[PDB]
Ligand binder design. Structure first.
Ligand SMILES: COc1ccc(NCc2ccc(F)cc2)cc1
Length: 291
């Protein structure tokens, strides 16, 4: 799967909010482009002169994420974050020249991402009470990954002593994205666990934080809530469900070729962090079938 790389696999089946620190610093920002940020401004002007209803929005930038020594007390992860924007994303990661920017970043900074916006996404492996994961079909008319299968998620917009408010907004945003798109009541959702961070190599290496969320509703009840909003209540064109039993071998199915890279990241991390048992009971052959 060359279109997805794992940047972080969390320990302990996934990290809760209270175990994560963020450092939000202008040291973590994109570097100005070698010939100047005027190239980003020009692409934006061209875009707005065709689609004048578009608007810019701030985003978090991922610089790096460092895990504590395994089995340790105290905070377990440090997220190093900067600020970026939708405009900067359109002029860097989305640009036809994005690979030239990655080569220049290696040369100038020893950092393939130094000249990329790299907005931080969020996604969820959302499980039902009857042990299915939730999938969404993307419209064939959107700009990125048209017609592909996705999981719930989005690209959070901003607003350890400002750090803890940032971690709070990241965890809050994955629940809000589930409530907005799947139309689920917030009180049917568990507090999220961070499974890990995946990079989309088809979008010049931008990263998404991938979470596990449990729902107290069954697959049939989730479907009812999704559909009862009507076509204007969701950006996706359909919902569907795969048994957690069958997610284990999803990379061997015809579905895998239809999954967008960030959804592939979510399912790889679910299989490694929540699946793959470590103990004698769940590791026994009748509960963990060989092959
Ligand atoms: C041409 O416009 C596009 C609009 C949206 C997208 N994809 C989602 C998305 C990625 C990164 C973001 F920062 C914000 C949204 C790509 C291209």
């Amino acid at each position: 799967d060359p279109e997805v790389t794992l940047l972080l696999q969390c320990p302990g089946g996934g990290l809760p909010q209270e175990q994560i620190q963020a450092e939000l610093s202008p040291a973590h920002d994109r570097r100005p482009l070698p010939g100047g940020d005027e190239a980003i401004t020009a692409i934006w002007e061209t875009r707005l002169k065709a689609q004048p209803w578009l608007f810019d929005a701030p985003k978090f930038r991922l610089h790096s994420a460092t895990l504590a020594p395994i089995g340790s007390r105290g905070p377990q992860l440090l997220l190093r974050l900067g600020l970026t924007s939708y405009r900067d994303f359109l002029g860097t990661n989305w640009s036809s020249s994005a690979a030239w920017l990655r080569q220049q970043g290696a040369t100038d900074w020893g950092d393939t991402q130094a000249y990329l916006a790299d907005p931080l996404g969020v996604g969820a492996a959302l499980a039902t009470a009857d042990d299915f994961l939730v999938f969404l079909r993307r419209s064939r008319q959107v700009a990125e990954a048209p017609g592909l299968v996705d999981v719930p998620g989005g690209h959070p917009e901003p607003q350890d002593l400002a750090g803890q408010l940032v971690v709070h907004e990241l965890f809050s945003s994955v629940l809000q994205e589930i409530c907005d798109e799947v139309n689920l009541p917030l009180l049917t959702l568990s507090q999220p666990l961070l499974l890990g961070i995946a990079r989309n190599e088809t979008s010049a290496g931008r990263a998404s934080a991938e979470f596990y969320v449990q729902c107290s509703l069954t697959s049939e009840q989730v479907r009812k809530h999704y559909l009862s909003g009507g076509p204007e209540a969701h950006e996706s064109t359909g919902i569907f469900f795969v048994e957690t039993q069958n997610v284990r071998r999803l990379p061997e199915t015809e579905m895998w070729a239809e999954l967008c890279p960030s959804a592939k990241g979510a399912i790889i991390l679910y299989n490694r962090v929540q699946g793959s048992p470590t103990g004698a009971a769940l590791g026994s052959p009748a509960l963990l079938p060989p092959l």
